[PDB]
Design a protein around this ligand. Structure first.
Ligand SMILES: N[C@@H](CCC(=O)N[C@@H](CS)C(=O)NCC(=O)O)C(=O)O
Ligand SMILES: N[C@@H](CCC(=O)N[C@@H](CS)C(=O)NCC(=O)O)C(=O)O
Lengths: 219, 220
């Protein structure tokens, strides 16, 4: 009976996407803190587990999986007692995959990580307008995802919603979501806030926001 | 036949083209010229509001994102799963490497620089954009260990994803074969595939487009 181990810290958006998924699956697991501020991802012990020095990492028995999106797909496929969260139908799965690849690059790499690195790590107090533009571009794209639908990848909650909420709920540290401009995006956030296990995201999202607010900058 | 929307110079388009060739799946190819802003036409925006390529239409289905498209293609049309294994541990590694490509390689290192130079008319590139490329090469060199592919001992769609972007990044930073012997050997391995010209043709066009827009790098 495998109980997996998750490595991470709650402030990290992709770690929170995996925390939401584990909670949705009601799957017990051990959680090991990798304090990124203590540069703990660069330890010799952790670099053996993950040469990319990133979190989250999941150890599942003898398996070692990095990347929140790979981890979430793996978790649902192995332990999911239905497949609503990651449907087996190929066209619907492709939409969930598409939305997670979108989160990986357009949201996380291009908008979030870039700006967070500048502010939280490099101590910059001025950032170019393009870093703010990356954020509003992401919001604009996600607003358009909804159409006549409730969630980012269909009419059911999927791991793509967990992926995208983890980062969008972090980006609001930099640019709050204008509810008038983004009504569908705002409603979707409100909907997810009502999940019984949403604190697996909101606690760390609030920590991320607090860390960002303590490092002011101009543009 | 499936329909693929793209242009050969685009890296993620070329990852899909490689996949289609590997699968021997005939398709209609519709060229969307990005330099002429054809992705912003009323008709293309209807098909894909993100105005991106590649886009695949298959019957009444629509799939965007090269990595989503490739996984779908192998799972739907592959005669076996070698290019995208059904085993969950093996699949997770392929997924991991494609997610890595999408963010660390494509969004962070390639698209950033290419948009600046090719589309936005900038000639001054911060040293940070060059650092983002060498970081990527360092990460990929480390994937191999004793294996010959990025996601295990057999060719997978993760190889097609990473070669499409790495073969474009050399426009900016040629791969030092002394520093990156495994990455170099892997490129040479893929170059042997009978259908590799589905990547090399457009990669050369990408390189040519970059050489036509001279730039300098700024920063210690
Ligand atoms: N998109 C990747 C992101 C992984 C990532 O970059 N995690 C950051 C924390 S938000 C990290 O580990 N930074 C530590 C480092 O790069 O050294 C995923 O979904 O897992
Ligand atoms: N994550 C996507 C990237 C798609 C993408 O950014 N495509 C570029 C071409 S390299 C594009 O369509 N640019 C046109 C635009 O954004 O308007 C994938 O793997 O397919």
């Amino acid at each position: 009976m495998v109980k997996p181990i998750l490595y991470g810290i709650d402030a990290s958006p992709p770690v929170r996407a995996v925390k939401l998924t584990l909670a949705a699956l009601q799957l017990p697991y051990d959680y090991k803190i990798v304090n990124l501020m203590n540069k703990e991802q660069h330890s010799e012990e952790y670099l053996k587990k993950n040469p990319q020095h990133t979190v989250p990492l999941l150890e599942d028995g003898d398996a070692n999986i990095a990347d929140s999106h790979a981890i979430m797909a793996y978790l649902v496929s192995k332990y999911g007692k239905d497949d609503s969260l990651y449907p087996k139908d190929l066209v619907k799965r492709a939409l969930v995959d598409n939305r997670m690849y979108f989160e990986s690059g357009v949201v996380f790499a291009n908008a979030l990580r870039s700006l967070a690195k500048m502010i939280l790590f490099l101590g910059k107090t001025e950032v170019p307008q393009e870093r703010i533009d990356a954020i509003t571009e992401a919001y604009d794209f996600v607003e358009a995802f909804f159409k006549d639908q409730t969630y980012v990848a269909g009419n059911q909650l999927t791991i793509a919603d967990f992926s995208l909420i983890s980062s969008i709920s972090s980006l609001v540290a930099f640019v709050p979501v204008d509810a008038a401009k983004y009504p569908k995006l705002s409603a979707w956030i409100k909907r997810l806030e009502q999940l019984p296990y949403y604190a697996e995201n909101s606690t760390g999202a609030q920590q991320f926001v607090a860390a960002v607010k303590s490092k002011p900058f101009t543009v």
